[PDB]
Amino acid sequence: GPPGPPGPPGKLGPPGPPGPPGPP
Amino acid sequence: GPPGPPGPPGKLGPPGPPGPPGPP
Amino acid sequence: GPPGPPGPPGKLGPPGPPGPPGPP
């Protein structure tokens, strides 16, 4: 037999880091 | 022959975009 | 056949949290 297909995709990545501080 | 099984899951996705700036 | 390759990478993650307030 041939190689199997690629597996399922990986999980959703983590959330991004917090945004910048707001202005004065 | 039968195809092989699907492979392992992919890598975890990359971290998301940084969040928006805070409030004033 | 052999097991397949690892799957595609996961989706990039959600946006990060909003940033901290600015100074008063």
Amino acid at A16: G
* Distances from the Cα of A19 to the Cα of A3, A16, B11, C22, angstroms: 44, 8, 25, 12
Please tell me whether residue B18 adopts helix, strand or coil conformation: coil
Partner-chain residue, chosen from C4, C8, C12, that has the shortest CB–CB distance to B4: C4
Question: Scanning every residue of chain B, which has its alpha carbon at the shortest distance from the alpha carbon of C10?
Answer: B13
CA B18 to chain centre: 16
Give the DSSP letter of residue A13.
P
Interface of A with B in 1-24 (CB under 8 A): 1-24
Closest CA to A24 of C9, C22, C15: C22
Chain centroid to CA C3: how far? Answer: 27
Q: Which residues contact A17 (CB under 8 A, 6 or more apart)?
A: B15, B18, B19, C16
Give the Cα separation of C15 and B18 in Å (integer): 6
Technique of determination: X-ray
Of C20, B15, B20, the closest CA to residue A16 belongs to B15
